[PDB]
């Protein structure tokens, strides 16, 4: 059966104002009578959000692969949810997704982007990702602006996408949730069929 629902995915680097704006549109989703779920990625749902916690405070030391790939499992142990939200016709908000699995990965940890992308393949691919664009210039793991900037690299992977939306984020709050919204008003309103990654 058809996505009913939108799936709306918000990418960008540490500082980039994400949870600003994926609030900002929850609210005018919900003030404009849609229905919306908040996810954000990653998170302590179960045990394994709770190990991903460790290792951004680097209170473990974890393997490039072992960390990436939990990063990856936090996604697919919320596709159920996500599948039966959008069934129903209830929208998705999500801070952070499949891109900054790979753009993480790659950029921070070296390693190569196909064997990043893999374990994602078969996630709910949203409608639209908008990706809010601070070049990194002059706590947690990657805090580091040189760590910074490689990573605003490998996001440039995705910017050719049909599906990928640049948004300048050192613009005014404001001006940026008004640029949001504009987008999300273009979505088609009908159901579609479920797409996945890397499609
Ligand atoms: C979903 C996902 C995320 N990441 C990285 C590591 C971490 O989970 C996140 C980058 N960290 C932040 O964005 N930290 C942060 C800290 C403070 C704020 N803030 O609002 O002041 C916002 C963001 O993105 C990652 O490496 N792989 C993944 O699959």
């Known amino acids: 059966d058809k996505k009913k629902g939108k799936f709306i995915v918000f990418e960008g680097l540490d500082r980039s104002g994400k949870s600003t704006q994926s609030k900002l549109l929850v ?8 229905e919306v779920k908040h996810l954000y990625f990653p998170n302590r749902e179960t045990g394994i959000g709770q190990i991903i ?4 405070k ?10 990436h790939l939990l990063f990856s499992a936090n996604r697919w142990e919320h596709m159920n949810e996500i599948k039966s939200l959008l069934l129903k016709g209830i929208w998705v908000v999500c801070d952070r997704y499949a891109y900054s699995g790979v753009a993480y990965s790659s950029g921070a940890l070296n390693l190569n982007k196909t064997w990043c992308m893999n374990p994602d393949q078969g996630l709910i691919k949203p409608d639209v990702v908008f990706y809010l664009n601070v070049p990194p210039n002059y706590e947690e793991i990657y805090e580091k602006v040189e760590t910074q900037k490689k990573i605003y690299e490998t996001y440039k992977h995705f910017a050719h996408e049909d599906y990928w939306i640049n948004i300048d984020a050192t613009r005014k709050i404001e001006d940026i949730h008004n640029d949001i919204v504009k987008e999300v008003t273009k979505i088609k ?10 499609s």
């Not at 609210?27 to 849609?34: A, D, F, I, P, Q």
């Not at 680097?58 to 960390?67: A, G, L, P, Q, Y």
């Open 27 to 34: 609210e005018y989703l919900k003030n404009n009578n849609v």
């Open 53 to 56: 916690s460790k290792y951004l």
């Open 58 to 67: 680097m209170e473990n030391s974890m393997s490039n692969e072992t960390i």
């Open 189 to 198: 309103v009908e159901p579609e069929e479920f797409n996945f990654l890397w």
